[PDB]
Structure 1
Amino acid sequence: SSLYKTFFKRNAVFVGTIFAGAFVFQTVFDTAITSWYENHNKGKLWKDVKARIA
């Protein structure tokens, strides 16, 4: 790695880094997994059926 210990030296900034990482990870993982789960089921959801019904 390198000489950066402003992330790992102090436990305050380390646990703040872990909390900020999880705060981003919840949003990003949820949006990505919803997009994949709807992309894998194209045509079966109610969004596609409601768009099909004129």
Structure 2
Amino acid sequence: SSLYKTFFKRNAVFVGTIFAGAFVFQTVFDTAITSWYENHNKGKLWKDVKARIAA
């Protein structure tokens, strides 16, 4: 896979880059999961129930 040799060129990924990528992942991954989860449960959430309420 030449896609690897463009970014890291035959060398292993260094801890600094690993740590940095981890912070990014944490945020991205969380939003992706929360989104899917809330969508999959559309109609049941409190957000949805509050929309059909007015007091």
- TM bin, normalised by shorter chain, reads 0.7 to 0.9
Task: Give the alignment's TM-score, normalised by structure 2.
Answer: 0.73
Q: How far apart are the structure 1 equivalents of 2:11 and 2:19?
A: 12
* Structure 1 ranges of 4+ moved more than 4 A: 1-13
Identical amino acids, percent of aligned pairs:
100
What are structure 2's unaligned runs of at least 5 residues? Answer: none
Backbone CA RMSD of aligned residues: 3.1
Point out which structure has higher relative CO (alpha carbons under 8 A, 6+ apart): 1
What are structure 1's unaligned runs of at least 5 residues? Answer: none
Match of 1:6 in 2: 6
Change in Cα spacing, 1:44 to 1:51, as seen in structure 2 (3 Å) is same
Q: How far does the alpha carbon of each residue in 1:2-54 deviate from its partner, in whole angstroms, 9 at most, with x for none? A: 59879758999710100011000000000110000000000000000001116
